[PDB]
Amino acid sequence: LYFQSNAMKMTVVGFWGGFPEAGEATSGYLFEHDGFRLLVDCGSGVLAQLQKYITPSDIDAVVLSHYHHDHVADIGVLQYARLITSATKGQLPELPIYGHTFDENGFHSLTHEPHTKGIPYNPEETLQIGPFSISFLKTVHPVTCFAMRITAGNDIVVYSADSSYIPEFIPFTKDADLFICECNMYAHQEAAKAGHMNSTEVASIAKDANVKELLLTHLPHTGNPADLVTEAKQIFSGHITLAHSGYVWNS
Amino acid sequence: AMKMTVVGFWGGFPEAGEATSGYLFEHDGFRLLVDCGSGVLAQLQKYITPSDIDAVVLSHYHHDHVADIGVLQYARLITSATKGQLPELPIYGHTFDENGFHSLTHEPHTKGIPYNPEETLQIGPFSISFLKTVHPVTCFAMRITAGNDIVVYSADSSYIPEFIPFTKDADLFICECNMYAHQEAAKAGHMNSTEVASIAKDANVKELLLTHLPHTGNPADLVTEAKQIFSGHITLAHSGYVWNS
Ligand code: NA
Ligand code: NA
Ligand SMILES: [Zn+2]
Ligand SMILES: [Zn+2]
Ligand SMILES: [Zn+2]
Ligand SMILES: [Zn+2]
């Protein structure tokens, strides 16, 4: 394959855990490589926020970690956007939306023929979506969920999706250039019961896996989330970024 | 007295940084959200908090009118767990879409409450009657009263003459206007500016608010088109538009 390294751009579209704060969005991350636009998760407010960066026609594929509302809320209106745009501005190609099949109802919802098509992913195999190669790790969370290791050439981006701490994250996240990790809890808070991680746990993974940059996301709605960075810095010495709308990372 | 804030107004899907159908009604401190589409929970918090919502009522289960119900359920759950227990939030909807109605319940945070389109519904200080619209899925327009004020919300529909008695003397008619005057609307279960203006005229409404807007052309032309037929006050929906009685 002839996909170039160091030519991937990741833009944070939404980053709030559970529900969005004012004027923003829950989980949604735009990955771009040589004109191919991959949307990772598609939560509440994501279609509105996405259009700060690209049009709905510009999306080439969507991939989903799990079917919680904060990760899929805008799939339906995305399907309507493709249908309406095709009718009024010119026919678009069928949009593939990649999801797991452990929630059959959730997976079925991804297809709105002929505008979008649900395509299953197999978490035990490596998926190719345009220039992106993706492998998966099953997380620990109240519904079936998969973390993703997204590569193009030699680039490595890991997205935790949602999880409580598991040691399997260490080998999975090994040497990642960017680790986009949920951090729903502060250091003083127990997170595992809820299927989430705290800043201590997240920082531990970043350190053990020797990641280059840690991006704290899926943020809580109490406190000052900047404190998560301060807490994580006590443990992990690499670069730490707090997710915000329009944060851009270049590989 | 009654107040209405446009939270979202785009038809089908939202434009950048905005939202699809969602209208916040307020009377005597009671906050009623009419429809709950995409981007609505994000936009709503420019005005009130999720805790502040007292009830929600839904015209139909198309994605552009219900997309944010799930994250609203999560907002109530999360807020109760972290900031203090909230009352159970009633979400009123029709029962003809069984799966859609069932979704509205997430105990103990929200509860689906059926409305009967043949009866008048009482939600706190608001009284709502319904008109079945013509649209690809089952849908109901709403005549919403509090005190001496009347607001009619078309929800989504192709033109039907039953709108005229239903909308009679409304202080505000919030009407979908998905098509320009030159465009066929009925076959899509929508209305054009000519049809909308025809209802406002025949019903003698006091203000007309054009909403559920299209994503082509210049929507200001809808106002110009409607004014050729309806001589009353005409407003094009935008984020944060406030109507007061
Ligand atoms: Na393109
Ligand atoms: Na209140
Ligand atoms: Zn989540
Ligand atoms: Zn989740
Ligand atoms: Zn609609
Ligand atoms: Zn509709």
Q: Which residues contact B211 (CB under 8 A, 6 or more apart)?
A: B6, B9, B21, B174, B175, B176, B177, B237
Candidates B10, B13, B106, partner chain A, best to mutate (most A CBs within 10 A) = B13
Query: Shortest CA distance to B111 belongs to which of B93, B97, B127, B124?
Result: B93
Q: Which ligand sits nearest to residue A43's alpha carbon?
A: 3
Q: Name the DSSP letter for residue B106.
A: B
For helices B193-202 and B220-227, give the axis angle rounded to 10 degrees.
Answer: 50
Give me the residues of B, 76-105, that contact A with CB < 8 A. Answer: 77-79, 82-83
Resolution of the structure in the document, Å: 1.5
Measured between beta carbons, the chain B residues lying within 8 angstroms of A18 are 71, 74-75, 77-78
Report the alpha-carbon distance of residue B187 to residue B168 in Å, rounded. Answer: 25
CATH architecture of the region B1-245: 4-Layer Sandwich (3.60)
Q: What are phi and psi of A18, to 5 degrees?
A: 80, -55
* A1-251 maps to CATH 1.20.1560.10: no
Cα separation, B106 vs B129, whole angstroms = 26
- Method by which the model was determined: X-ray
